[PDB]
Design an enzyme around this catalytic site. Structure first.
Site, mmCIF file in Angstrom:
data_model
loop_
_atom_site.group_PDB
_atom_site.id
_atom_site.type_symbol
_atom_site.label_atom_id
_atom_site.label_comp_id
_atom_site.label_asym_id
_atom_site.label_seq_id
_atom_site.Cartn_x
_atom_site.Cartn_y
_atom_site.Cartn_z
ATOM 1 N N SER A 65 0.879 -1.078 -0.002
ATOM 2 C CA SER A 65 0.107 -0.041 -0.117
ATOM 3 C C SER A 65 0.902 1.357 0.089
ATOM 4 O O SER A 65 1.829 1.268 -0.935
ATOM 5 C CB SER A 65 -1.005 0.075 1.181
ATOM 6 N N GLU B 7 -9.150 -3.696 -4.609
ATOM 7 C CA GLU B 7 -8.468 -2.752 -3.873
ATOM 8 C C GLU B 7 -9.277 -1.549 -3.401
ATOM 9 O O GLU B 7 -9.159 -1.149 -2.423
ATOM 10 C CB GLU B 7 -7.508 -1.999 -4.729
ATOM 11 N N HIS C 120 -7.921 -4.866 -0.332
ATOM 12 C CA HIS C 120 -6.776 -4.073 -0.011
ATOM 13 C C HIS C 120 -5.923 -4.431 1.633
ATOM 14 O O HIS C 120 -7.212 -4.300 2.513
ATOM 15 C CB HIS C 120 -7.098 -2.613 -0.050
#
Ligand SMILES: *[C@@H]1O[C@H](CO)[C@@H](O[C@@H]2O[C@H](CO)[C@@H](O)[C@H](O)[C@H]2NC(C)=O)[C@H](O)[C@H]1NC(C)=O
Ligand SMILES: *[C@@H]1O[C@H](CO)[C@@H](O)[C@H](O)[C@H]1NC(C)=O
Length: 534
Positions: free
Chosen positions: A209, A341, A449
Site C-alpha cells: 500500500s 483494492e 486491500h
C-alpha cells in the site's frame, strides 16, 4: 546475547527470540523534534556502545484515519480509542520515532552475506509503525526453503509530520520528509548490515500500500540514481498494491490548502512565517490540528491530505511522466494487486447514492478533470451493480447504487490499473506481476486491500506461497521461480502480449491469467494521467 559490532565500532546486544534473533529499536537519525520538525532527517551522531535493543521503539505520530475538520461519530470514536491510556500503552507513538529493526535466523553471524528484505510499511501515508508486521513467518519459511534472509524494517514520519507540503515547505527544501527518512534507513543498511550477517549488495525493498508507493518513489528518486557511495542501495523491488502516486507538485493547490488549514488549526493562521509557527506548537496541539484535517477514511478518501508529491529536486516531475521518460533505477521488480483494492475506500462515500451525486463526488475528488473526462469515466465504470467491485459478485454487495462503482474506480486509479501503466512503460529490468482472488466470496470487501499482510505475516494460506516463498526466492535469486512452486510464474512484458502474464491466486492455490481486464477504464484514467491527480 545476540551481538553485532556496527560500522563505527559500537557493539550492541539484541534479543534471542528462539526462532530468530532480533535487534529492535536501533536509532538511525536524530529525533526530528522542535526546529527539526518537517526537516530532512539528520544522521544519528551518538553512541550505542554497550546498549541493548530488545523491543520496538514508539511509532511516529499517527493521524486519526477518520480525522476531518467536520465533527462526526467515527472521528469522535477513533479519538476516544487513540487517546486512551490502554491504546497509548499497547501502541506508543512519539515524534522521536526514527528507529530501525534487524531480525535474522538463529545463528547468523557477521560475514554470512544473507539477502536482505527491507520492509516499508504503508498506512495511507498517515498511520503505521514497524511493530505490526511480524517477520517470524517470513524468516522461518526462508530457513525451511534453504534460502534464509535477514528482515529489516524502518520507521518513517507519516501524516503532517512526514508529508507537509505547500509553498513554504518547497521554499525551504523540506518536501517528502518521510521518504527521506526511509532513504536514510537504506543508507544505514548499506553501511551496517554486514555486521548483522547481511550482504549490502543483495537488498530487496518491499512494501505494501503506501509502503509500495514508497518503493515506487525510491525507484524514481533522484531520477533513478539509486547509488550511495558508488553502489546501488537495492538490487530489486517488490510492490504489493501501489505504484506511482497520482500527485500534483508540492506547492500545488491542495498541498497549499492543507498547509493553510493545518496552520489555522494549530493557531498559526496569523503568523508571518507559518512554518516557524508550526515548529513552535506543542505535540498535543499539532496532533490535534492534524486530526482536524481529512484522514484517508474520511469522505475525501483517496484525495489524501499527506502523500509523496513531486518537488522538482528529489522527485523531479509528475511520477507518470518520469516512468514514460525512463527516469528510474533499472532493477527486476514484482508488482501485484488484490482483486478488490477500492472496496475499503468506497466505504467513505456511502452517502453518495445517485449518478448525479457520483458525478459531483468525482468532480470534488478530481479537480483537474474536465466534464468530458468525468463523462468518459462514468461510461467506462457504469452504474450497473454487476460491473463493480467486489468484482464478479453480480447483484450482491449493493450497499448503495454506487458503492461498487466508486470502489471499482478508486481501486483502479490508485492501484490496479496504475500498476498496468507502470508495467507497460517500465523497461528497467524483468517484471513479474500477480493478481489475487484469494478471498473471492468475502462479503462487502472481496479480496480486499491489505489481506495480503495477513497471509504474509500472520496466517498461512494459498497466498503465503507468493507473499513468502516466491518473494524469498526473488530476494535470493532475482527470480521467483527458484521457489519450486508448481505453477511457473511467466514474465510480464506487456498487457497486449499473447499468453498469460499474471500469476493468480485463489483459495486452492495458484494459476495464471491475463492482464486484459477493464481496458476501457485504463484509457479513461490514463490517457492524460494529470487529469486525475490530487
Ligand atoms: C456526504 O457527506 C460529506 C461529508 O460530510 C458531505 O460533504 C461535506 O458537506 C458539508 C456540508 O455541506 C461541508 O461543509 C463539508 O465541507 C463537506 N466535506 C467534504 C470533505 O467535502 C457531502 O455533502 C455528502 N454528500 C452527499 C452526496 O450528500
Ligand atoms: C535530493 O536532491 C539533491 C539534488 O540532487 C541532492 O543533493 C540530495 O542529495 C537529494 N537527497 C536525497 C536524500 O537523495
Amino acid at each position: 546475547a545476540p551481538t553485532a559490532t556496527l560500522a563505527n565500532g559500537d557493539t550492541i546486544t539484541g534479543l534471542n527470540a528462539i526462532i530468530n534473533e532480533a535487534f529492535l529499536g536501533i536509532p538511525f537519525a536524530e529525533p526530528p523534534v522542535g526546529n527539526l520538525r518537517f526537516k530532512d532527517p539528520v544522521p544519528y551522531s551518538g553512541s550505542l556502545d554497550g546498549q541493548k535493543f530488545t523491543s520496538y521503539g514508539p511509532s511516529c505520530m499517527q493521524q486519526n484515519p477518520e480525522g476531518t475538520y467536520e465533527e462526526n461519530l467515527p472521528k469522535a470514536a477513533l479519538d476516544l480509542v487513540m487517546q486512551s491510556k490502554v491504546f497509548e500503552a499497547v501502541s506508543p507513538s512519539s515524534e522521536d520515532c526514527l528507529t530501525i529493526n534487524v531480525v535474522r535466523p538463529p545463528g547468523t553471524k557477521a560475514g554470512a552475506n544473507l539477502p536482505v528484505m527491507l520492509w516499508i510499511f504503508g498506512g495511507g501515508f498517515e498511520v503505521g509503525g514497524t511493530s505490526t508486521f511480524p517477520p517470524a513467518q517470513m524468516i522461518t519459511k526462508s530457513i525451511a526453503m534453504g534460502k534464509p534472509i535477514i528482515h529489516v524494517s524502518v520507521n518513517y514520519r507519516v501524516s503532517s509530520w512526514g508529508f507537509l507540503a505547500g509553498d513554504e515547505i518547497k521554499a525551504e527544501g523540506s518536501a517528502n520528509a518521510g521518504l527521506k527518512d526511509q532513504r536514510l534507513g537504506m543508507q544505514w543498511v548499506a553501511d551496517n548490515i554486514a555486521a548483522f550477517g547481511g550482504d549490502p549488495t543483495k537488498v530487496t525493498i518491499f512494501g505494501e500500500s503506501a509502503g509500495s508507493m514508497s518503493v515506487m518513489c525510491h525507484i524514481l528518486w533522484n531520477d533513478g540514481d539509486n547509488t550511495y557511495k558508488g553502489k546501488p542501495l537495492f538490487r530489486a523491488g517488490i510492490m504489493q498494491s501501489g505504484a506511482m502516486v497520482p500527485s500534483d507538485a508540492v506547492d500545488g493547490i491542495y498541498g497549499n490548502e492543507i498547509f493553510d488549514l493545518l496552520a489555522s488549526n494549530a493557531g498559526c493562521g496569523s503568523a508571518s512565517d507559518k512554518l516557524a509557527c508550526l515548529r513552535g506548537v506543542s505535540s498535543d496541539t499539532l496532533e490535534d490540528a492534524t486530526n482536524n484535517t481529512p484522514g484517508f477514511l474520511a469522505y475525501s478518501s483517496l484525495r489524501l491530505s499527506y502523500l509523496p508529491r513531486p518537488d522538482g529536486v528529489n522527485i523531479t516531475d509528475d511520477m507518470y511522466a518520469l516512468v514514460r521518460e525512463g527516469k528510474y533505477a533499472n532493477i527486476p521488480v514484482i508488482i501485484g494487486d488484490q482483486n478488490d483494492e477500492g472496496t475499503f475506500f468506497g466505504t467513505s462515500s456511502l452517502n453518495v447514492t445517485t449518478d448525479a451525486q457520483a458525478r459531483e463526488y468525482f468532480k470534488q475528488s478530481f479537480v483537474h478533470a474536465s466534464d468530458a473526462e468525468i463523462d468518459t469515466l462514468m461510461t467506462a465504470y457504469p452504474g450497473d451493480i454487476t460491473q463493480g467491485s467486489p468484482f464478479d459478485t453480480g447483484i450482491l454487495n449493493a450497499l448503495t447504487p454506487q458503492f461498487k462503482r466508486i470502489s471499482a474506480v478508486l481501486g483502479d486509479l490508485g492501484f490496479t490499473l496504475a500498476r498496468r501503466y507502470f508495467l507497460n512503460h517500465y523497461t528497467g529490468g524483468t517484471k513479474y506481476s500477480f493478481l489475487s482472488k484469494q478471498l473471492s466470496g468475502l462479503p462487502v470487501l472481496g479480496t480486499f486491500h491489505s489481506n495480503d499482510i495477513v497471509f504474509q505475516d500472520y496466517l498461512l494460506g494459498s497466498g503465503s506461497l507468493i507473499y513468502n516463498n516466491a518473494f524469498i526466492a526473488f530476494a535470493t535469486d532475482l527470480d521467483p521461480n527458484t521457489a519450486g512452486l508448481l505453477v511457473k510464474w511467466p514474465e510480464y512484458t506487456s498487457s497486449s502480449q499473447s499468453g498469460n502474464n499474471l500469476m493468480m491466486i485463489n483459495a486452492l492455490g495458484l494459476y495464471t491469467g491475463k492482464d486484459n481486464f477493464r481496458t476501457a477504464g485504463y484509457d479513461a484514467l490514463f490517457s492524460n494521467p494529470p487529469s486525475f491527480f490530487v
